[PDB]
């Protein structure tokens, strides 16, 4: 018959630093065993302080993003101001529920800085449940990214060691290498890397090379 | 969904310097039968963009009547605007997406090429709604066959002329005819350029059968 | 079930058989599958006999209106798109497949296959469950610029060939020659079916 | 007499008084002016306060990144129609993923105002609109009427005492094309002066502007950025 | 499966019900009240699907209270059962079917006591005694032996306990506590809640 | 998922785990399952997480519209009945939500339960979730309405810690909330494993 | 199927100047019996009765809707209904449900109000009216109730021979039906009077 | 009197004055003319300049209903754009039905039927606009039809709508338009436009011309500025 | 009469909207004040007989924790809007999970003001214009704010606003007492001065209701105890 969904792969990471928030995802878009293209940026910039990742079925990733951008203008025209990172997260929760009977198939990750200047990472599910955490992951390699950030970022399971708050210099190199290690063992990750760092001064994009296999 | 019949074949497209070539076979297919050997699978949209598709051709003629009238209605308006190759690629993305929620999806795979204001556009949509932009695109088994052929050229030579492009298409049209049982000999090579869309008539390709003597 | 139409200089020849069988038993061995939609506009019924007869009346209802509003015979392209849109839109509940052919003062004789919901122009068109086995004769024996006498025999030989191989086809051959001066209706009795290789 | 009771009934001269009363409703609002160059477009809006303690009302409504509009007429009739304009523009980026052409938006505005006219019981929308926007063909100044008529314009002034501005717009029309962003503000604020009384003239409190341009998206200015714009302009 | 039982005496109606409300493998509420009061002398016993039991019975509860307030007097026992059957029969062919088993207990100043049996298909039949659930098979047979129209409530309550003690022997589900009430000329009278200090 | 609540002389105590998992992978360990409705009124979560977050806020919406209307500080009984009726209209469409409502009113510290099919119950001790049966054992053992404030914390603490040990879907840190007449208050947040080391010794 | 849920049997035989109708008293759910007092025959007015069988949900529901149309018909018209008129009324009530049809097999028996003439008829699930000159029966055991009335029926029978014939047909045929039994109510419709009797039957 | 209040109420003489008053509103509109010949049909419209503040190309009075079907409307511009899209919906639904371009006689009938439908109901109002419909084809040929506010279509070798009509219709009768070619007809169209307009009330205007026929290959097309200026110079040879 | 609710004037204004504002002069007087320390609201109970209970009269309603409201004009139309304004306020927190700006509170309510008509409407359509005037005070991220709406739906930010029958002389009196940084407690004093002048009755502790919102304290209604301490300061 007709299959309404298909797994398009990909991986999305978000980490909340002290004064900063970093969000990165790959460019690889592939369905089944074939590659559609090697450049397909999933990272979308909502506002200056907020960047949303999308990992899942690509058809729902495009439409749901256009629906969010439409409601961004509804807010700003009404409220004369931009949405906070926490306001965008709670909004899409009700957006994902409106489909509760025929849910959108996607994994959304929202990150950025709040009014206090602290990073806020928001991980979602197709039914719309959400939470705030220091760092989250998503996509096909989501199982791979989480343990590495628990030890390195979270300082977990380490006895008698100095705990230093997250630094931007290390946070960049940690996000780069976890994807370098991801592109090794993940068939759905590689070919390029795009890193979007949201700070108090503004957003700064980066490009990192990865293996083409 | 139910049963469409009226099956199509693969479609190829690529980018070169100052233009886009899109070629497809003229054969309609019913089940395992090759029935209609003369069909125009490449449709022109205004001057600067062009469309071709696969899958159900009966649904494609319906997309002719819908998109065609909508494009003509703009030419009837005469406001001085023309649908951009991204606009046609965007409208087909939502139009095909709107058919999934009503549980009546149309079987088709469409490719939108075009050249406007020095910007060469080639894009891909699908019944499943997957949409993106790539310098070389193909449908059906072409993505398995003709796609890696063009990727190797674009990596070595990102810039291709109009003659080099048509020569690579014929070489890709030659390979697709070999390994695709549902393909067909007669095809049309259509090229959009600064002069607009120009669709060449029925064409063929010289085949090398020497494998017959090398096997035996 | 076999329907056939062949275009020539002065018009078209649209043939059909008389056999209508629901299942393995013949309901009626003599039936006319050509239902006039207009003077020169005819429709060859095929597929489901119940759905084809319903569309033929729904098509005639729309064509008579379009014909009386213009006070002139509608074009063959007009009658073909009526059957197609009724086919394509209602294909959910309608499995019928029709072949539209006729003559107009513009381009003359025309034959438009409406089968499966699409539309295309052909010099000769064949349809039905028995048209699949006659592809060999209609392709090779077709020659350009055949006289009306040769077109009647070319259409008869292929239909009589389908009637032999198709189990659902039989009866008598109905021929309709649609030209500018009128339409001639002929019936070929079982003795007049052209004899082919019998072994 | 008895022909002004509704829209549908025609006068013996073939006129609809209710449409006339809707066109006179727009002239009872604030006076706003706008103009475009070969590059930029500037919309100068006059803000009024209901009382001395009350803050000035907002006459500028943000529509699209390249599009802006000033409302003159019944306030709530503009708001329901603004929800229609914004919805159509959101639908443009929801479907076409491109900024809606300003000429196609205004054509949808008229179609919305053509619906109430031909039907009995439904009142026409009594708000007028001065809308501007930038596209591939450059900036455009459009005006709409409650009669559903809409025109393409180089520059216009709507509201009370607008002819003293329009006369100013006629004399400097030759300069409006070649001036740059800083001069368009100078001509726009001096054009607003003619619609204003002889006592209260120019204050950054009740005067606000907006600007769209080639690479410049539509941006609303209120006080801080308007203060240097008023400086250096002699009235 | 919840259990219901009722008995029609000459001047009285004796009804009883299980107080256990369970979910999955555990009993969440063992004191749960299955008895709903339709009118002064008219009670109701509703069991069935956990969702349809409370929801559909509360509809009947107020619909009976609708009649009593509009005309100033409550439905009769016969009038109440026949209106509840139409309510259950109307939703039978709807998209929300109700699975419930109801016993209507009431007393009339003329016809006297009345007990009514109702299934999930809304089939109303008057009977001197009736029961629901799987426990109805282990109980009603005892009533066949000991029932007489002249029985006194003093012996009926004793025979009711003999039937309900069979639910603790053969019948598998525990059901520790049962609620028992009686209807007569003097109104609703509560009886000692059956308790088994196990 | 393990959630439990019980009422006694000093009021209700709500205890819950922090862990919610999808399949074999743990989605988040730090999830806060307890829903905050009113200052003195406290909800919970069970089953689907999105169904709870959606409907419990509608209950919090109804409770606030009530207090803004009549100012009567809606009772726990009225809140539990309104939550059950909203689940009845959509019954059969696939909505799965468990929950428990806790709070004090003129009658007392009421404890109610609302199921996915509309089951509304009342009693002294409730629990829900995948580990509810593991909670019933420890809670029932050594429980009386006369338990003090400090003794009841030890019962609620050992309830989650020993129940989440036997469940693969239950874990995280123990979040226990006592209920009072003025309102509920956060008592302690402690990891299950950190308390496991104290119980083994 | 669904008609076998409550079982049941209805019998109507035509005599000479009179007609007799009979049905059993049993009501049960599958293997679980309920009550002995169930009534399968409801009065349609003077000298006209109707039998009902099958699922008892529709038995009591259609009986309402037939009394719905009966009383409205009797209040509008100044004369009583003819048994031939009622047959077509049940046909319309069952046919309007053609998508959702009720489950029952109504049996109508009575006397022509003209002078003495007896009239009988029965319908089906599809609501097809049928007129027979001998007898009509319906139920799950209807195959058993045929053979009794086939041989025993005579062209003309007095009330003495009619009651004896229909009673023996009920007692013998119902005893072979598992879902039927527990007493038989027999109604005798004569020109002068109407007789109702309850037969002594086995409890089984 | 109350008889002319609603269109559903007849006058004492058996007329509908509401339809008549909608026709009087058309008489205030600007003048637009058209002429058909063997080569095709030539369109022209007088577009009045309301102010210098309006951009070139504003208030376009040349309407395109369908690829082979042009239209020029004189009347209320609100009801003009309404029927404009409605006429396009009828031509689009035709091609969605019969799969080709609707003939001009068949299109003028369906549109005029939609116009007369609002004259019957008292809950709506009739159209206050009148327009002409040209078309060209190889099987039919040049055809010109005009629909009034009452919804009745008449075949015309030439027609004039707006304020000045009878004066322009007599000038067309003074010379045979059939044997002419669209190149020579546009010379007469611009000649009539200059005769109709003088400076008394109106100030300035602009020439909006359109061609359909062999020159345009049977498709509705606007006249370019180069040919328009050259067509004016042919009319600038005389004026007198 | 001989016209619809949608019929325009020869000057182009709706009769039903004009008469709606003219009906507010029959309502109750309420005076709001916006200050840097909060927003003050005061209203008179208007007791025409001792048999009535002052507890049943609430002319100051609470939309949100930090957002208050005032009431005048027709009572029947206000109770419909007070409930609708509350629902949309919670629909905001149900969606965006934040407190609605008082400007958006005035925005959502102003939408339903002019929706009224006859043809081409639903059964939930209003026939007649609102005869109620409203005052929305409150504190938000931008500080204390006080807004006003009329039957036409126009909402305007105001430093001080008065409604009711006495709004004619009270609004002119607010310009006199309001200067620069004047605090909440000082505004409460000036509120009772103007309110006592405009009322026909005597100012009493239980005669008027007084409620204020602060940046550090939620909207609070002063009870009979505190009201006696406030009136004492006169």
From Swiss-Prot, chain A:
PROSITE patterns per UniProt: PROTEASOME_BETA_1, PROTEASOME_BETA_2
The record, for Pfam families, names: Proteasome (PF00227)
Q: Where on the tree of life does the source sit, at the highest rank?
A: Eukaryota
Keywords of this entry: Acetylation, Cytoplasm, Glycoprotein, Nucleus, Phosphoprotein, Proteasome
Q: Tell me one GO biological process term.
A: proteolysis involved in protein catabolic process
Which PANTHER family does the record cross-reference, listed alphabetically?
Answer: METALLOPROTEASE TLDD, PROTEASOME SUBUNIT BETA TYPE-1
The species this protein belongs to is Bos taurus (Bovine)
Similarity remark: Belongs to the peptidase T1B family.
Q: What is this protein called?
A: Proteasome subunit beta type-1
Name the lineage. Eukaryota, Metazoa, Chordata, Craniata, Vertebrata
Question: Which residues carry attached sugars according to the database record?
Answer: 30, 181
Q: Which residues carry this modification: Phosphotyrosine?
A: 122
Swiss-Prot record, chain C:
Q: What is its EC number?
A: 3.4.25.1
* InterPro entries, A to Z: Ntn_hydrolases_N, Pept_T1A_subB, Proteasome_bsu_CS, Proteasome_sua/b, Proteasome_suB-type
Q: What class of enzyme is it?
A: hydrolase
Residues carrying N6-acetyllysine: 33, 89
| Molecular function, one GO term | endopeptidase activity
Summarize induction of expression: Up-regulated by interferon gamma (at protein level).
Could you list this entry's UniProt keywords, alphabetically sorted: Acetylation, Cytoplasm, Hydrolase, Immunity, Nucleus, Protease, Proteasome, Threonine protease, Zymogen
Give the misc comment.
Encoded in the MHC class II region.
UniProt protein name: Proteasome subunit beta type-9
Biological classification of the source: Eukaryota, Metazoa, Chordata, Craniata, Vertebrata
UniProtKB/Swiss-Prot annotation, chain E:
Record GO biological process: proteasome-mediated ubiquitin-dependent protein catabolic process
Q: Which PROSITE patterns match?
A: PROTEASOME_BETA_1, PROTEASOME_BETA_2
Asked if the record carries the keyword Cytoplasm, the reply is yes
Query: Which UniProt keywords are listed?
Result: Acetylation, Cytoplasm, Nucleus, Proteasome
Any GO CC annotation of this UniProt entry:
nucleus
Positions of transmembrane segments: none
Instruction: Supply the CDD domains for this chain.
Output: proteasome_beta_type_2
UniProt xrefs under InterPro entries: Ntn_hydrolases_N (IPR029055), Proteasome_beta2 (IPR035206), Proteasome_bsu_CS (IPR016050), Proteasome_sua/b (IPR001353), Proteasome_suB-type (IPR023333)
Residues that bear N-acetylmethionine: 1
Instruction: Using the UniProt record, give the first listed, main subcellular location.
Output: cytoplasm
The compartments listed are: Cytoplasm; Nucleus
Q: Pfam families of this UniProt entry? A: Proteasome
Q: State the function annotated in the UniProt record.
A: Non-catalytic component of the 20S core proteasome complex involved in the proteolytic degradation of most intracellular proteins. This complex plays numerous essential roles within the cell by associating with different regulatory particles. Associated with two 19S regulatory particles, forms the 26S proteasome and thus participates in the ATP-dependent degradation of ubiquitinated proteins.
Family note: Belongs to the peptidase T1B family.
The subunit field of the Swiss-Prot or TrEMBL record says: The 26S proteasome consists of a 20S proteasome core and two 19S regulatory subunits. The 20S proteasome core is a barrel-shaped complex made of 28 subunits that are arranged in four stacked rings. The two outer rings are each formed by seven alpha subunits, and the two inner rings are formed by seven beta subunits. The proteolytic activity is exerted by three beta-subunits PSMB5, PSMB6 and PSMB7.
Designated name of the protein? Proteasome subunit beta type-2
> What is the native source organism of this protein?
Bos taurus
Swiss-Prot record, chain H:
InterPro entries in UniProt: Ntn_hydrolases_N, Proteasome_alpha, Proteasome_alpha-type, Proteasome_asu_N, Proteasome_sua/b
Q: Which UniProt keywords apply?
A: Acetylation, Cytoplasm, Nucleus, Phosphoprotein, Proteasome
Subcellular localization(s) per the UniProt record: Cytoplasm; Nucleus
GO biological-process terms attached to the record: proteasome-mediated ubiquitin-dependent protein catabolic process
One GO cellular component this record assigns the protein to is: nucleus
Q: Which domain of life is it from?
A: Eukaryota
Q: Does the keyword Protease apply?
A: no
* First-listed, main subcellular location of the protein, grouped into a coarse class: cytoplasm
Acetylation listed as a keyword: yes
Pfam families reported for this sequence: Proteasome, Proteasome_A_N
Post-translational modification Phosphoserine, affected residues: 238
Q: Which residues carry this modification: N6-acetyllysine?
A: 52, 201, 225
Subunit text? The 26S proteasome consists of a 20S proteasome core and two 19S regulatory subunits. The 20S proteasome core is a barrel-shaped complex made of 28 subunits that are arranged in four stacked rings. The two outer rings are each formed by seven alpha subunits, and the two inner rings are formed by seven beta subunits. The proteolytic activity is exerted by three beta-subunits PSMB5, PSMB6 and PSMB7. Interacts with AURKB. Interacts with CDKN1A. Interacts with MDM2 and RB1. Interacts with the C-terminus of TBXA2R isoform 2. Interacts with DNAJB2.
The similarity comment for this entry is: Belongs to the peptidase T1A family.
Entry protein name: Proteasome subunit alpha type-3
Species whose genome carries this gene = Bos taurus (Bovine)
Q: By which gene is this protein encoded?
A: PSMA3
